[PDB]
Amino acid sequence: MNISPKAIKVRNIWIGGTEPCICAPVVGEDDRKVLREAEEVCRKQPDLLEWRADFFRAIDDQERVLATANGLRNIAGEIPILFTIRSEREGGQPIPLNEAEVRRLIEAICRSGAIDLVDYELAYGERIADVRRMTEECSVWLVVSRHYFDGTPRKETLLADMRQAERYGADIAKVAVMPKSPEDVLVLLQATEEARRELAIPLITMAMGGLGAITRLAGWLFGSAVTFAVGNQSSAPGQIPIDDVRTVLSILQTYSR
Amino acid sequence: MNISPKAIKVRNIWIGGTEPCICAPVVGEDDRKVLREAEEVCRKQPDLLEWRADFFRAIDDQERVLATANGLRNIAGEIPILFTIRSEREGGQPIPLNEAEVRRLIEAICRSGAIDLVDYELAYGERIADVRRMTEECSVWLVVSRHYFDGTPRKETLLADMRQAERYGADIAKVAVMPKSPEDVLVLLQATEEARRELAIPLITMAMGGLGAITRLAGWLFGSAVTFAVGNQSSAPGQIPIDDVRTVLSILQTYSR
């Protein structure tokens, strides 16, 4: 059984195939720190590496961000790199640049050849058309995401977000929620299961915090193609150390069907 | 945040508290096979022992059963023993004695004081009162169950089954289903969580098979107080080796809170 209806091949690795994919974040404040951190994460064996660039102090210095991205590429080797500048309105660090300046920076990084996927938030709406066309020219995969840090929307709303994301041209739809009860955790899994049967692209879903731990370890059984785990530092509440995720995935796969 | 609204103390072990309980079945066609399985299973340190007496070929002999019952009680130290005679219509083996004898055997076994819990089918409706008082006299806990081996009924049906089990005086309500899809697995968890908020007693739920593995490792997050694992032999589809269950529970437990 494949996690997604149609798996995507990223640098020889499959997302949405038979195997769950683990992505570990890198959150350094500057070049030296981002590189050392990447080295550490990469020794662990994540399937994907996410550079959370919103923590980067020199984010408004295009040359430094590019040199760092080029450095990350060499450290990552064959491991695909996901470039994410999480907006402040969706839990990211405040940054000294505009909505338009973020778009100019994502394009410069995409055209560098250093990264494989880019995250762009669903809420910026119409402005997604340009990012999509431009990523397709750079052969960069587009992950369109939405994060709810205040709670968990009804299933209908989550399904709508993912449908929206796909309509906008995303290669992968990502939705994260903050559960306030075990019921919210089920809603996230149910939305994920239903969306997997309705959409043609791989999904990345997770319920954050302690209550959502099970979604990071078993969401793939319901269609979540990627789980975010800690390779060194954590980028979101509830992320579990990579080794523990691997241990549970191993057992779940051996005994699931 | 306890698994159940009011934990129950059974011979040194709490069911429905903070810790999920692991129950291991002992299936043995005859006294010797049975007693062999017990030593082995008990060597692994499960919280509870379920001897599936419906495998016993000589169930027609109370002296033999009582003898065995007394024997296993000897091998199990303080490990609580759940005495179960699974109907054939609910996944149980072939049984030579009919209804009355079972209840008579259950009474005889209850008064022997060799067991701590007794599993009885909700399907026996009014006849449950009979076993109900039979169990209360000997200070034996009553588990009222329902097993669906051909599929997974609607959430409403599962919720109704558990409500009725409590209505008939159950100390613990149990429902098992056979999922045919991931959606079925979520139906079982949803019913568990809904039942958890409605009943005052502990609940035991599971989706069998490979598809249902997740439910044996994470059902406790939705209200299932007991999970069945393999200590020696399997008594139902999808049971996982006790060592692997412990591995996941520990990880899931540290990270869920």
PDB file of all heavy atoms in Angstrom, chain B residues 74-95:
ATOM      1  N   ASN B  74      -1.866 -20.896  40.095  1.00  0.00           N
ATOM      2  CA  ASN B  74      -0.624 -21.149  40.804  1.00  0.00           C
ATOM      3  C   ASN B  74       0.579 -20.593  40.046  1.00  0.00           C
ATOM      4  O   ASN B  74       1.520 -20.077  40.649  1.00  0.00           O
ATOM      5  CB  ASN B  74      -0.438 -22.654  41.012  1.00  0.00           C
ATOM      6  CG  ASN B  74       0.588 -22.965  42.080  1.00  0.00           C
ATOM      7  OD1 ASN B  74       1.096 -24.085  42.162  1.00  0.00           O
ATOM      8  ND2 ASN B  74       0.887 -21.975  42.918  1.00  0.00           N
ATOM      9  N   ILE B  75       0.555 -20.710  38.721  1.00  0.00           N
ATOM     10  CA  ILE B  75       1.655 -20.214  37.903  1.00  0.00           C
ATOM     11  C   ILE B  75       1.598 -18.698  37.866  1.00  0.00           C
ATOM     12  O   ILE B  75       2.621 -18.022  37.927  1.00  0.00           O
ATOM     13  CB  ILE B  75       1.570 -20.763  36.491  1.00  0.00           C
ATOM     14  CG1 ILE B  75       1.651 -22.291  36.536  1.00  0.00           C
ATOM     15  CG2 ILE B  75       2.699 -20.185  35.645  1.00  0.00           C
ATOM     16  CD1 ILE B  75       1.467 -22.959  35.187  1.00  0.00           C
ATOM     17  N   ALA B  76       0.395 -18.156  37.742  1.00  0.00           N
ATOM     18  CA  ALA B  76       0.256 -16.711  37.759  1.00  0.00           C
ATOM     19  C   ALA B  76       0.370 -16.413  39.243  1.00  0.00           C
ATOM     20  O   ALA B  76      -0.254 -17.088  40.061  1.00  0.00           O
ATOM     21  CB  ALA B  76      -1.113 -16.299  37.243  1.00  0.00           C
ATOM     22  N   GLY B  77       1.181 -15.439  39.619  1.00  0.00           N
ATOM     23  CA  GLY B  77       1.279 -15.145  41.035  1.00  0.00           C
ATOM     24  C   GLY B  77       0.084 -14.275  41.341  1.00  0.00           C
ATOM     25  O   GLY B  77      -1.028 -14.755  41.535  1.00  0.00           O
ATOM     26  N   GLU B  78       0.324 -12.975  41.355  1.00  0.00           N
ATOM     27  CA  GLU B  78      -0.725 -12.008  41.599  1.00  0.00           C
ATOM     28  C   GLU B  78      -1.283 -11.495  40.269  1.00  0.00           C
ATOM     29  O   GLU B  78      -2.222 -10.706  40.255  1.00  0.00           O
ATOM     30  CB  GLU B  78      -0.178 -10.849  42.420  1.00  0.00           C
ATOM     31  CG  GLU B  78       0.152 -11.226  43.851  1.00  0.00           C
ATOM     32  CD  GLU B  78      -1.052 -11.794  44.573  1.00  0.00           C
ATOM     33  OE1 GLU B  78      -2.155 -11.224  44.424  1.00  0.00           O
ATOM     34  OE2 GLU B  78      -0.897 -12.807  45.289  1.00  0.00           O
ATOM     35  N   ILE B  79      -0.712 -11.940  39.151  1.00  0.00           N
ATOM     36  CA  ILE B  79      -1.218 -11.494  37.857  1.00  0.00           C
ATOM     37  C   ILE B  79      -2.688 -11.863  37.792  1.00  0.00           C
ATOM     38  O   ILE B  79      -3.065 -13.026  37.971  1.00  0.00           O
ATOM     39  CB  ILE B  79      -0.503 -12.145  36.636  1.00  0.00           C
ATOM     40  CG1 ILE B  79       0.917 -11.599  36.464  1.00  0.00           C
ATOM     41  CG2 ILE B  79      -1.267 -11.792  35.340  1.00  0.00           C
ATOM     42  CD1 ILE B  79       1.845 -11.898  37.584  1.00  0.00           C
ATOM     43  N   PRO B  80      -3.548 -10.863  37.566  1.00  0.00           N
ATOM     44  CA  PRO B  80      -4.981 -11.112  37.482  1.00  0.00           C
ATOM     45  C   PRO B  80      -5.292 -12.057  36.330  1.00  0.00           C
ATOM     46  O   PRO B  80      -4.667 -11.979  35.258  1.00  0.00           O
ATOM     47  CB  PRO B  80      -5.553  -9.717  37.248  1.00  0.00           C
ATOM     48  CG  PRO B  80      -4.600  -8.847  37.971  1.00  0.00           C
ATOM     49  CD  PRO B  80      -3.263  -9.419  37.603  1.00  0.00           C
ATOM     50  N   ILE B  81      -6.242 -12.958  36.551  1.00  0.00           N
ATOM     51  CA  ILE B  81      -6.644 -13.894  35.512  1.00  0.00           C
ATOM     52  C   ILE B  81      -8.082 -13.680  35.066  1.00  0.00           C
ATOM     53  O   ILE B  81      -9.020 -13.723  35.881  1.00  0.00           O
ATOM     54  CB  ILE B  81      -6.488 -15.368  35.963  1.00  0.00           C
ATOM     55  CG1 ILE B  81      -5.024 -15.656  36.319  1.00  0.00           C
ATOM     56  CG2 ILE B  81      -6.906 -16.297  34.845  1.00  0.00           C
ATOM     57  CD1 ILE B  81      -4.775 -17.102  36.790  1.00  0.00           C
ATOM     58  N   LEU B  82      -8.240 -13.436  33.766  1.00  0.00           N
ATOM     59  CA  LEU B  82      -9.540 -13.234  33.146  1.00  0.00           C
ATOM     60  C   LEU B  82      -9.930 -14.569  32.515  1.00  0.00           C
ATOM     61  O   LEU B  82      -9.195 -15.094  31.669  1.00  0.00           O
ATOM     62  CB  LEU B  82      -9.452 -12.152  32.070  1.00  0.00           C
ATOM     63  CG  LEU B  82     -10.537 -12.039  30.990  1.00  0.00           C
ATOM     64  CD1 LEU B  82     -11.877 -11.603  31.570  1.00  0.00           C
ATOM     65  CD2 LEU B  82     -10.063 -11.023  29.960  1.00  0.00           C
ATOM     66  N   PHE B  83     -11.067 -15.119  32.949  1.00  0.00           N
ATOM     67  CA  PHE B  83     -11.570 -16.399  32.450  1.00  0.00           C
ATOM     68  C   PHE B  83     -12.547 -16.104  31.332  1.00  0.00           C
ATOM     69  O   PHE B  83     -13.563 -15.438  31.542  1.00  0.00           O
ATOM     70  CB  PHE B  83     -12.284 -17.167  33.556  1.00  0.00           C
ATOM     71  CG  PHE B  83     -12.821 -18.499  33.117  1.00  0.00           C
ATOM     72  CD1 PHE B  83     -11.990 -19.603  33.036  1.00  0.00           C
ATOM     73  CD2 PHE B  83     -14.158 -18.646  32.770  1.00  0.00           C
ATOM     74  CE1 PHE B  83     -12.473 -20.841  32.614  1.00  0.00           C
ATOM     75  CE2 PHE B  83     -14.657 -19.879  32.348  1.00  0.00           C
ATOM     76  CZ  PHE B  83     -13.805 -20.982  32.269  1.00  0.00           C
ATOM     77  N   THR B  84     -12.239 -16.616  30.145  1.00  0.00           N
ATOM     78  CA  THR B  84     -13.044 -16.374  28.961  1.00  0.00           C
ATOM     79  C   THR B  84     -13.421 -17.629  28.177  1.00  0.00           C
ATOM     80  O   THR B  84     -12.562 -18.455  27.866  1.00  0.00           O
ATOM     81  CB  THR B  84     -12.284 -15.453  27.989  1.00  0.00           C
ATOM     82  OG1 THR B  84     -11.880 -14.263  28.676  1.00  0.00           O
ATOM     83  CG2 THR B  84     -13.148 -15.098  26.782  1.00  0.00           C
ATOM     84  N   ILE B  85     -14.705 -17.762  27.865  1.00  0.00           N
ATOM     85  CA  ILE B  85     -15.203 -18.859  27.038  1.00  0.00           C
ATOM     86  C   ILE B  85     -15.890 -18.165  25.869  1.00  0.00           C
ATOM     87  O   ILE B  85     -17.095 -17.918  25.885  1.00  0.00           O
ATOM     88  CB  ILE B  85     -16.214 -19.762  27.785  1.00  0.00           C
ATOM     89  CG1 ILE B  85     -15.490 -20.556  28.877  1.00  0.00           C
ATOM     90  CG2 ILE B  85     -16.870 -20.709  26.812  1.00  0.00           C
ATOM     91  CD1 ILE B  85     -16.411 -21.417  29.753  1.00  0.00           C
ATOM     92  N   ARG B  86     -15.099 -17.836  24.856  1.00  0.00           N
ATOM     93  CA  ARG B  86     -15.604 -17.144  23.682  1.00  0.00           C
ATOM     94  C   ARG B  86     -16.604 -17.972  22.879  1.00  0.00           C
ATOM     95  O   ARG B  86     -16.331 -19.108  22.521  1.00  0.00           O
ATOM     96  CB  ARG B  86     -14.435 -16.730  22.770  1.00  0.00           C
ATOM     97  CG  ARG B  86     -14.836 -15.877  21.554  1.00  0.00           C
ATOM     98  CD  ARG B  86     -15.102 -14.421  21.948  1.00  0.00           C
ATOM     99  NE  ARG B  86     -13.892 -13.761  22.444  1.00  0.00           N
ATOM    100  CZ  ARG B  86     -13.747 -13.260  23.669  1.00  0.00           C
ATOM    101  NH1 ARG B  86     -14.739 -13.334  24.547  1.00  0.00           N
ATOM    102  NH2 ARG B  86     -12.598 -12.683  24.019  1.00  0.00           N
ATOM    103  N   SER B  87     -17.768 -17.392  22.613  1.00  0.00           N
ATOM    104  CA  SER B  87     -18.787 -18.064  21.824  1.00  0.00           C
ATOM    105  C   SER B  87     -18.170 -18.407  20.473  1.00  0.00           C
ATOM    106  O   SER B  87     -17.129 -17.847  20.107  1.00  0.00           O
ATOM    107  CB  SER B  87     -19.974 -17.137  21.604  1.00  0.00           C
ATOM    108  OG  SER B  87     -20.767 -17.616  20.541  1.00  0.00           O
ATOM    109  N   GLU B  88     -18.799 -19.318  19.730  1.00  0.00           N
ATOM    110  CA  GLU B  88     -18.275 -19.690  18.423  1.00  0.00           C
ATOM    111  C   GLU B  88     -18.722 -18.631  17.429  1.00  0.00           C
ATOM    112  O   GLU B  88     -18.000 -18.301  16.482  1.00  0.00           O
ATOM    113  CB  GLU B  88     -18.788 -21.072  18.002  1.00  0.00           C
ATOM    114  CG  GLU B  88     -18.038 -21.680  16.812  1.00  0.00           C
ATOM    115  CD  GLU B  88     -18.329 -23.167  16.638  1.00  0.00           C
ATOM    116  OE1 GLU B  88     -19.506 -23.554  16.800  1.00  0.00           O
ATOM    117  OE2 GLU B  88     -17.391 -23.943  16.335  1.00  0.00           O
ATOM    118  N   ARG B  89     -19.913 -18.089  17.666  1.00  0.00           N
ATOM    119  CA  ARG B  89     -20.471 -17.053  16.811  1.00  0.00           C
ATOM    120  C   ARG B  89     -19.693 -15.741  16.931  1.00  0.00           C
ATOM    121  O   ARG B  89     -20.007 -14.766  16.248  1.00  0.00           O
ATOM    122  CB  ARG B  89     -21.935 -16.803  17.176  1.00  0.00           C
ATOM    123  CG  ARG B  89     -22.142 -16.281  18.581  1.00  0.00           C
ATOM    124  CD  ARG B  89     -23.619 -16.131  18.901  1.00  0.00           C
ATOM    125  NE  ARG B  89     -24.193 -14.902  18.358  1.00  0.00           N
ATOM    126  CZ  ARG B  89     -25.497 -14.702  18.195  1.00  0.00           C
ATOM    127  NH1 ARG B  89     -26.351 -15.659  18.526  1.00  0.00           N
ATOM    128  NH2 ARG B  89     -25.951 -13.543  17.726  1.00  0.00           N
ATOM    129  N   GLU B  90     -18.685 -15.713  17.798  1.00  0.00           N
ATOM    130  CA  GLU B  90     -17.891 -14.509  17.981  1.00  0.00           C
ATOM    131  C   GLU B  90     -16.393 -14.787  17.956  1.00  0.00           C
ATOM    132  O   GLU B  90     -15.623 -14.193  18.718  1.00  0.00           O
ATOM    133  CB  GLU B  90     -18.306 -13.805  19.278  1.00  0.00           C
ATOM    134  CG  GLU B  90     -19.653 -13.085  19.152  1.00  0.00           C
ATOM    135  CD  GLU B  90     -19.977 -12.169  20.327  1.00  0.00           C
ATOM    136  OE1 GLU B  90     -19.060 -11.479  20.829  1.00  0.00           O
ATOM    137  OE2 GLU B  90     -21.158 -12.124  20.738  1.00  0.00           O
ATOM    138  N   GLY B  91     -15.993 -15.699  17.067  1.00  0.00           N
ATOM    139  CA  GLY B  91     -14.588 -16.046  16.911  1.00  0.00           C
ATOM    140  C   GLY B  91     -14.077 -17.155  17.811  1.00  0.00           C
ATOM    141  O   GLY B  91     -12.915 -17.568  17.716  1.00  0.00           O
ATOM    142  N   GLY B  92     -14.936 -17.649  18.690  1.00  0.00           N
ATOM    143  CA  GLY B  92     -14.506 -18.705  19.586  1.00  0.00           C
ATOM    144  C   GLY B  92     -14.483 -20.098  18.972  1.00  0.00           C
ATOM    145  O   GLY B  92     -15.172 -20.373  17.991  1.00  0.00           O
ATOM    146  N   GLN B  93     -13.674 -20.969  19.571  1.00  0.00           N
ATOM    147  CA  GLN B  93     -13.510 -22.357  19.149  1.00  0.00           C
ATOM    148  C   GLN B  93     -14.816 -23.157  19.270  1.00  0.00           C
ATOM    149  O   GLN B  93     -15.858 -22.608  19.648  1.00  0.00           O
ATOM    150  CB  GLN B  93     -12.436 -23.010  20.024  1.00  0.00           C
ATOM    151  CG  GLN B  93     -11.059 -22.380  19.883  1.00  0.00           C
ATOM    152  CD  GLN B  93     -10.484 -22.578  18.496  1.00  0.00           C
ATOM    153  OE1 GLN B  93     -10.290 -23.712  18.056  1.00  0.00           O
ATOM    154  NE2 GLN B  93     -10.215 -21.476  17.795  1.00  0.00           N
ATOM    155  N   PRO B  94     -14.780 -24.465  18.926  1.00  0.00           N
ATOM    156  CA  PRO B  94     -15.966 -25.332  19.014  1.00  0.00           C
ATOM    157  C   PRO B  94     -16.083 -25.844  20.445  1.00  0.00           C
ATOM    158  O   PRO B  94     -15.097 -26.318  21.026  1.00  0.00           O
ATOM    159  CB  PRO B  94     -15.653 -26.447  18.020  1.00  0.00           C
ATOM    160  CG  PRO B  94     -14.172 -26.607  18.187  1.00  0.00           C
ATOM    161  CD  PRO B  94     -13.693 -25.159  18.205  1.00  0.00           C
ATOM    162  N   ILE B  95     -17.292 -25.762  20.993  1.00  0.00           N
ATOM    163  CA  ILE B  95     -17.560 -26.148  22.376  1.00  0.00           C
ATOM    164  C   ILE B  95     -18.646 -27.235  22.514  1.00  0.00           C
ATOM    165  O   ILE B  95     -19.761 -27.074  22.030  1.00  0.00           O
ATOM    166  CB  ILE B  95     -17.952 -24.876  23.171  1.00  0.00           C
ATOM    167  CG1 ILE B  95     -18.285 -25.209  24.615  1.00  0.00           C
ATOM    168  CG2 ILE B  95     -19.146 -24.198  22.510  1.00  0.00           C
ATOM    169  CD1 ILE B  95     -18.528 -23.977  25.461  1.00  0.00           C
TER     170      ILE B  95
END
